[PDB]
Design an enzyme around this catalytic site. Structure first.
Site, mmCIF file in Angstrom:
data_model
loop_
_atom_site.group_PDB
_atom_site.id
_atom_site.type_symbol
_atom_site.label_atom_id
_atom_site.label_comp_id
_atom_site.label_asym_id
_atom_site.label_seq_id
_atom_site.Cartn_x
_atom_site.Cartn_y
_atom_site.Cartn_z
ATOM 1 N N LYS A 93 -15.639 -6.738 -9.481
ATOM 2 C CA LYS A 93 -14.827 -7.612 -10.325
ATOM 3 C C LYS A 93 -14.202 -8.749 -9.512
ATOM 4 C CE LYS A 93 -10.997 -7.280 -13.578
ATOM 5 N NZ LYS A 93 -10.449 -6.401 -14.642
ATOM 6 N N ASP A 94 -13.804 -8.476 -8.265
ATOM 7 C CA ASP A 94 -13.276 -9.528 -7.404
ATOM 8 C C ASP A 94 -14.364 -10.505 -6.978
ATOM 9 O OD1 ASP A 94 -10.874 -8.220 -7.683
ATOM 10 O OD2 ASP A 94 -10.550 -7.879 -5.544
ATOM 11 N N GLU A 149 3.117 -35.031 -4.914
ATOM 12 C CA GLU A 149 1.987 -34.236 -5.391
ATOM 13 C C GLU A 149 2.389 -33.451 -6.632
ATOM 14 O OE1 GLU A 149 3.134 -34.658 -2.395
ATOM 15 O OE2 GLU A 149 1.908 -33.692 -0.853
ATOM 16 N N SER A 179 -0.431 -0.298 -6.833
ATOM 17 C CA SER A 179 -0.274 -1.361 -7.817
ATOM 18 C C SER A 179 0.474 -0.914 -9.068
ATOM 19 C CB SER A 179 -1.641 -1.907 -8.223
ATOM 20 O OG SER A 179 -2.194 -2.704 -7.195
ATOM 21 N N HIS A 190 0.801 -1.220 0.000
ATOM 22 C CA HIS A 190 0.000 0.000 0.000
ATOM 23 C C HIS A 190 0.837 1.275 0.000
ATOM 24 C CE1 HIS A 190 -3.079 2.815 1.653
ATOM 25 N NE2 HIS A 190 -2.145 3.135 2.529
#
Ligand code: HEM
Ligand code: HEM
Ligand SMILES: Cc1c(-c2ccc(Cc3ccc(OC(F)(F)F)cc3)cc2)[nH]c2cc(Cl)ccc2c1=O
Lengths: 48, 75, 49, 378, 60, 105, 52, 49, 52
Positions: free
Chosen positions: D226-227, D270, D204, D200
């Site tokens: 959107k999330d 795995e 971004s 923060h």
């Protein structure tokens, strides 16, 4: 080995039907909100 | 963090916006979207595909060779 | 100057109910809002279930 | 005036999820950050409800899972949500990492390095989780992975016996692996909070790699909705696995109880560890393979120092784009080789792929970035 | 005003209070009709195989 | 216009069109990564060049949001790309290297 | 203690706000009956009755 | 006045034939727009309800 | 490519700061030996050797 077989398939059917309803409606809500931004127009008018 | 009103300086820029209840959410979804999808596909096919084609050929050759090697030879 | 300001035409994006600029938009507003809120309400019903 | 802005507790929520300035053009690849948190909370809830009916006793650990999947009301759905959720967790992790690598997000050094810490802690958590049901693969996974420390000279065997709590894998190892698997996710959540704390400070990145302060939009309602859509697609992907193919990503041998006397012939990890398994076994040497194993993950910490290009993102760098996708296909090759037996020609293919991985990361990409700088005359 | 959506807006969606009451009542009747139709489809697709299609043979 | 020069310029023009930032109306210097030297150089730009840089970047971010490009007529031609930022950045670098050279003695 | 809220304005505000609080009470009541599957009330609803 | 949210504001109701502009206008420092918008709309809703 | 740090000033600074770095290294070594109870080194120390 898998006593839950039948119940899991019945759940899968209900899940497919609910997803087939919920996905396009939520997509439509997304497009509804974003349309404000997607059609905005910009212009540059400097003093000469 | 940062806040609106303190980011940077901008001058002489006009923005026109329309309300979301005044316009379509799907105005040219197929009449315009499909040409744009083909444009982007063409634009990136040459960057993305050849590595994975090389992988597919190495996969098939290596599997065929491993299968043939397990079969015995006369003498 | 600013007197040459003129909103570019949003004719492509407008809904059919408000294409014509010679009619009031007050009659159609309730139908449009009702459609959008119906979409939202169905979404919320499914999520609640 | 506004209590949403002035209340001591709500200011954090406002300055993190509501009024946060965000770029207007971040694509779907920025959704995996929130999906990783959705996955982490899913695993915490499902796991907590699985701990109400689990016992870490070596003589009853296997049977308690069957008791969950047979007698507990809807225990099967919880069990396979937790198992398939771990795989979805690693899908989102690798997409988050590849996103940051492609678009140059690594130039946030503190955020990147904390990310690397998160990757290692999530790996340890998922490794320990797989030991709890006490199947065949559980036992021999604990044996091999703990024995990796034996390569350390002069103290290795002491570290191994100290971790096992004895001369072999036994009840004490399972009880402590249960305690670690319980407690480690909360530490992960705290480090994820520090991840966002450092993020923060700068905000971004975006797909173009160009500063977006000229065009910022508030996080709410644009990326909240959107999330939400992306989360609904994650739930779709999870429930398809749980309700139509709950065993597709697992191994059948784990449905057999542990047996210290016999190891299965086709033992494989795995799927989300096979690439590193391929790296390890391609080196015929114990210490060499263990160092290559560790460096195959820790090289991400070196990735920030090798950036030579004067542009941040690969969007305008074709040669780097091609090398990036050659790296993705090479990692798919290492995963395939990791899933195949040790015979001709797979040994040489795995060696060439292991060499190509480090050659791409260390040599080719910086040279491409320098050729690109010279071509643009700067 | 004669429009269906217009009357839905005027009656149910304008206030948030009735918008929530309409949501909880809609989820109630949707739950009943959805479960009824889903089970009728799963039972038609699997005609005979389940126990409730054969339990009459073994019970007086 | 000799043997190797026209081949070099041909490969540079090829790469320029392949990069594709011209399809968003951008210039080369609009795409540079902002470090301290570049932030200082941008700070020193006159009003008009700054405002043009701002509007070009804003229009490109808008296109990237809409996943569109400009019509072919409006692409930035390779021969008309102006290195408006290069002299300022060059001076800033020369000043920093002078400072670094004084710190050694 | 709280005598400051005794006046004509506060009783006009309460008269204006009792329909909204009434409706949010109906919302909570129906939400509780729905979430708990309360047979005592749902047995009386017409179409719902067939579920039991 | 107490919080110095603006230098001035005015409400207006401009009338025309069968239409008009009903609303407000204000002038303020660049770091006060959100508070003025918030309080203004809050007062509209308060009078509405 | 940290070629900025090759000059008289930096070698002078390194000469000044070498003794403190050596003392901190000695502190680390002695602390490690004392914490681990490393018998290989401690068996040669005269008074400590009697504790085994
Ligand atoms: C539990 C694991 C993790 C969680 C929950 C997490 C969460 C997040 C979130 C929510 C964001 C902001 C939204 C977004 O950019 O998508 C973010 C950004 C970021 N993360 Fe992570 N992360 C994790 C692991 C990692 C790892 C392993 C790396 C890299 C090795 C990493 C590197 C980054 C970077 C570089 C950004 C900034 C992206 C940008 O600004 O464009 N994170 N992370
Ligand atoms: C990042 C978070 C987590 C991850 C990735 C994770 C992963 C896993 C995995 C892969 C398994 C193996 C499942 C199987 O093969 O059957 C497992 C099992 C288990 N986990 Fe977790 N886990 C997480 C968090 C938790 C938490 C917080 C708890 C409890 C507080 C928990 C409790 C359990 C239990 C009791 C089992 C054994 C039951 C079983 O095998 O299904 N897990 N976990
Ligand atoms: C090399 C190897 C592995 C293996 C195990 C783990 C990893 C990744 C990893 C690495 C370190 C780690 O710990 C840390 F987080 F650092 F603390 C946690 C996870 C990679 C490979 N797992 C096997 C499992 C079976 Cl059953 C058999 C053999 C193998 C086999 O030979």
């Amino acid at each position: 080995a898998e006593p839950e077989h039948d119940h899991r398939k019945r759940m899968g059917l209900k899940m497919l039907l609910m997803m087939g309803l919920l996905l396009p409606l939520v997509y439509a809500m997304k497009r509804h909100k974003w349309s404000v931004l997607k059609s905005r127009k910009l212009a540059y008018r400097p003093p000469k | 963090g940062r806040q609106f009103g303190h980011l940077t300086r901008v001058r002489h820029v006009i923005t026109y916006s329309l309300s979301p209840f005044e316009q379509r959410a799907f105005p040219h979804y197929f009449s315009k979207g499909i040409p744009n999808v083909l444009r982007r596909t063409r634009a990136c096919i040459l960057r993305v595909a050849p590595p994975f084609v090389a992988f597919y050929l190495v996969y098939t050759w290596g599997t065929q060779e491993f299968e043939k090697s397990k079969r015995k030879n006369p003498a | 100057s600013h007197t040459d300001i003129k909103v570019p035409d949003f004719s492509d994006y407008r809904r059919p109910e408000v294409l014509d600029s010679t009619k009031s938009s007050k009659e159609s507003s309730e139908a449009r809002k009702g459609f959008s809120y119906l979409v939202t309400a169905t979404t919320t019903v499914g999520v609640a279930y | 005036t506004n209590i949403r802005k002035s209340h001591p507790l709500m200011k954090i929520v406002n300055n993190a999820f509501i009024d946060l300035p965000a770029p207007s053009n971040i694509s779907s690849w920025w959704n995996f950050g929130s999906l990783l948190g959705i996955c982490l909370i899913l695993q915490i809830l499902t796991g907590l409800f699985l701990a109400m009916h689990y016992t870490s006793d070596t003589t009853t650990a296997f049977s308690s899972v069957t008791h969950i999947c047979r007698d507990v009301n809807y225990g099967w759905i919880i069990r396979y949500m937790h198992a398939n959720g771990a795989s979805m967790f690693f899908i989102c992790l690798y997409m988050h990492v590849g996103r940051g690598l492609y678009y140059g997000s690594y130039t946030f050094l503190e955020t990147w390095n904390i990310g690397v810490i998160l990757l290692l802690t999530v790996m340890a958590t998922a490794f320990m989780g797989y030991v709890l049901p006490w199947g065949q693969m559980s036992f021999w996974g604990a044996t091999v992975i703990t024995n990796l420390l034996s390569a350390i000279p002069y103290i290795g065997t002491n570290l191994v016996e100290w971790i096992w709590g004895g001369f072999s894998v036994d009840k004490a190892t399972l009880t402590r692996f249960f305690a670690f698997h319980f407690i480690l996710p909360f530490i992960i959540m705290a480090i994820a909070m520090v991840h966002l704390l450092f993020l923060h400070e700068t905000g971004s990145n975006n797909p173009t790699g160009i500063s977006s302060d000229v065009d910022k939009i508030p996080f709410h309602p644009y990326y909240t909705i959107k999330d939400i859509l992306g989360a609904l697609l994650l739930i779709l992907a999870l429930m398809l696995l749980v309700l139509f193919a709950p065993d597709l990503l697992g191994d059948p041998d784990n449905y057999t109880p542990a047996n210290p006397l016999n190891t299965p012939p086709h033992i494989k990890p795995e799927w989300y560890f096979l690439f590193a398994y391929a790296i390890l076994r391609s080196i015929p040497n114990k210490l060499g393979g263990v160092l290559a194993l560790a460096f195959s993950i820790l090289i991400l910490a070196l990735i920030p120092l090798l950036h030579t290009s004067k542009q941040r993102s690969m969007m305008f760098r074709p040669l780097s784009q091609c090398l990036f996708w050659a790296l993705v296909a090479d990692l798919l090759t290492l995963t395939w080789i990791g899933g195949q037996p040790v015979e001709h020609p797979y040994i040489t293919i795995g060696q060439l792929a292991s060499v190509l991985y480090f050659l791409l990361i260390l040599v080719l990409m910086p040279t491409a970035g320098t050729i690109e700088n010279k071509l643009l005359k700067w | 005003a004669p429009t269906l959506t217009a009357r839905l807006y005027s009656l149910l969606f304008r206030r948030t209070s009735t918008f929530a009451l309409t949501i909880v009542v809609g989820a109630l009747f949707f739950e009943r009709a959805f479960d009824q139709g889903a089970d009728a489809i799963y039972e038609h697709i699997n005609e005979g195989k389940l126990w409730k299609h054969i339990k009459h043979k073994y019970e007086n | 216009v000799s043997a190797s020069s026209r081949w070099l310029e041909g490969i540079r023009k090829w790469y320029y069109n392949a990069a594709g930032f011209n399809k968003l109306g951008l210039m080369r210097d609009d795409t540079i990564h902002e470090n301290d030297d570049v932030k200082e150089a941008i700070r020193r730009l006159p009003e008009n060049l700054y405002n043009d840089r701002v509007f070009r970047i804003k229009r490109a971010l808008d296109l990237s949001m809409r996943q569109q490009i400009l019509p072919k007529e409006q692409w930035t031609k390779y021969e008309e790309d102006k290195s408006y930022l290069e002299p300022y950045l060059k001076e800033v670098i020369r000043e920093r290297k002078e400072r670094e050279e004084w710190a050694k003695k | 203690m709280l005598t400051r809220f005794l006046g004509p304005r506060y009783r006009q505000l309460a008269r204006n706000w009792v329909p909204t609080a009434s409706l949010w009470g109906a919302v909570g009541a129906v939400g509780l009956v729905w979430a708990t599957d309360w047979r005592l009330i749902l047995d009386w609803v017409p179409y719902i009755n067939g579920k039991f | 006045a107490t919080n110095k949210l603006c230098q001035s504001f005015q409400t207006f109701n401009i009338c025309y034939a069968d239409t008009g502009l009903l609303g407000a206008h204000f002038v303020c420092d660049h770091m006060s727009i959100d508070d003025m918008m918030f309080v203004l709309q809050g007062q509209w809703m308060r009078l509405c309800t």
